[PDB]
Write a protein that binds this DNA or RNA. Structure first.
Lengths: 138, 123, 36
RNA sequence: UUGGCACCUCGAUGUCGGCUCAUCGCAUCCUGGGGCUGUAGUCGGUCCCAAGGGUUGGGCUGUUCGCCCAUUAAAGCGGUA
RNA sequence: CUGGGGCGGUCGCCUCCUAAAAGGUAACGGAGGCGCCCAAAGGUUCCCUCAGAAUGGUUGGAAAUCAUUCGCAGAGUGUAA
RNA sequence: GUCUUGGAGGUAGAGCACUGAUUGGACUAGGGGCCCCUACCGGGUUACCGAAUUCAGUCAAACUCCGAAUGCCAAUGACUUAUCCUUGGGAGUCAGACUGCGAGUGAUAAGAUCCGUAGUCGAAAGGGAAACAGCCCAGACCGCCAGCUAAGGUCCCAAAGUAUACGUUAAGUGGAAAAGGAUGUGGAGUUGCUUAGACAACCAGGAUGUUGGCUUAGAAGCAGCCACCAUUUAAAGAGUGCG
């Protein structure tokens, strides 16, 4: 449950999501994360559906990171009214999610805890996923 | 399998100071039955007189291909090594002559091991 | 039971694909599932 | 269903609801047959197959709906301008 | 004008975005403003450079002023981009 | 028009150079907590918020230090091509639709509305797509019982291969839908164990202390908080799971 504090504008365009994200296709702060696979809008409530239902399964766990952040106001005209006549009420918030962008990072956790604590948040997120760990070179 | 090297090396030492040995059954290995072959030996001395069940024909009978080759014909039979370093046999060879005849597993149609050069009647 | 996500629950459950239907069969008869 | 759009019809496509006459879809109310039961028998919940048949007489309101009277194996929804 | 009309709202002028790397380029799309003001806030000559920050001080204060460095501009440029 | 060459412009992308928004860590001006005292100066406790600043890392139509692809404006060298400029006479249309690409409104709904760009229809017949104004191919001066091809096809309807090679699927998929689910299945690859004897399957046994220190009437294996371990050991979790 997060929202941007004071935005430059209250009603914004919807954009065209395509291609790979500009950056952050690589978990680097913590150990294990989920990387998304499709392009989608992720609302505010679903990261709230994530940071809860990971700390269910992460009773004594490390810090849970979220590299996503919502800044796009998805917008509704009030229902059962005609087309046109002004752009509608800002219905809440919605985040920018390209495919390939590693969503979360979770640290202080072994393999086998991270294959279910990170799995159950992916049932709440509307995007097909894959588990992604780290790598050195480097 | 470098772990299998080390089992070969150490058990030879109680086979070059050895005189006698006896067949030991491996089916129905009760905990109290292990006590009635170890703690009667622990009333004698320490674990010199052995119970070990690492006794495949291909694991630990490759090790005993030197000393007293009277034992291979219980190859497809239940084997456990009982080797001796001290306290010559006057009492120890008849450890199995009381319990196994009816209790702590069956007598076992045992065909024996090295007594002098024979098969049956471990005395 | 009948559901599209057929899974074993406890480790006493086998997963036997009868008749084109991924059925799970177990000891305890509340594991009895099927997608169909 | 309330809707959005205005694409058949404004040299006419009769709009609510009843009475008749139905068919049909089953996402099933029964009846037939089963898994589970937090199923002792009795009576159930719930999930399965199954459309062949049955699926009421009122009071009120124009009412569909709704509540209530008493029965019933039950008093199913829904399309067909 | 209109997502039928009515009621609401707008009708003209300047700036931005939507505008697709010339330039235009729509909607009841997204933001602001404009019906003035300056006898100098005009012309020219000749000077000089900001805002903020830190350091220390007079009532001195989170800040009016005053000094030393920072400070390519985060200041102003009448009024708004 | 096409190639060379010269340009203007800040888009798509990107990245943070600013305007913003933001994740996390160090840093801690200030604050609060808690006490001492404050009758006042003040001090200490922070796993309490926290401005700067800094190490990384995200994201912007109204953000650009940067900046493409085409597109437009021209030159002078050509290599094709028939168009263009003025002038006058003469009218029609100033409601368009659909498809793709880029956009807004919309709910990244609509055979939705409203722009750019390109096509077609409209004003276009023929073959495809079963029939189909907008898709695919292609332009009907007229006759031929001429030939070659495009889109699409080549068992019967219905013209043309039961074509040829190598595979895949078993559902009628083809011949209509996702999150998810599965020892379905073909390839590619990685590793564990493994005749120094693996994986199942069978004859085996399960630890002594001990529930072990604290407990609920006791529960001694799972009341539950935990050092949760030393001996007999081929072994045995101070217990695999059912009770």
């Amino acid at each position: 449950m997060l929202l941007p504090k004071r935005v430059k504008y209250r009603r914004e365009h919807r954009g065209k999501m395509r291609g790979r994200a500009k950056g952050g296709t690589e978990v680097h702060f913590g150990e294990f994360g989920i990387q998304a696979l499709e392009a989608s809008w992720i609302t505010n409530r679903q990261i709230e559906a994530a940071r809860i239902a990971m700390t269910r399964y992460m009773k004594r766990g490390g810090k849970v990171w979220i590299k996503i952040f919502p800044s796009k106001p998805y917008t509704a005209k009030p229902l059962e009214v005609r087309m046109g006549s002004g752009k509608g009420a800002p219905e809440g918030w919605v985040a920018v999610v390209k495919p390939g962008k590693v969503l979360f990072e979770i640290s202080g956790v072994s393999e086998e805890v991270a294959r279910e604590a990170l799995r159950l948040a992916s049932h709440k997120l509307p995007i097909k996923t894959k588990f992604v760990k780290r790598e050195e070179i480097g | 399998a470098i772990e299998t090297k080390k089992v070969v090396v150490e058990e030879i030492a109680s086979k070059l100071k050895e005189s006698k040995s006896t067949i030991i059954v491996d089916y129905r290995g009760l905990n109290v039955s292990e006590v009635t072959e170890l703690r009667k030996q622990l009333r004698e001395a320490n674990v010199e007189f052995k119970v070990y069940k690492n006794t495949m024909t291909r694991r630990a009978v490759e090790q005993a291909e030197l000393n007293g080759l009277n034992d291979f014909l219980t190859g497809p039979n239940a084997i456990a090594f009982s080797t001796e370093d001290v306290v010559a046999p006057a009492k120890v060879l008849n450890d199995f002559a009381k319990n196994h005849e009816a209790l702590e597993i069956k007598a076992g149609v045992i065909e024996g091991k090295v007594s002098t050069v024979e098969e049956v009647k471990a005395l | 039971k009948v559901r599209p996500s057929v899974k074993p629950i406890c480790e006493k459950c086998k997963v036997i694909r009868r008749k084109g239907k991924v059925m799970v069969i177990c000891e305890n008869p509340k594991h009895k599932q099927k997608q169909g």
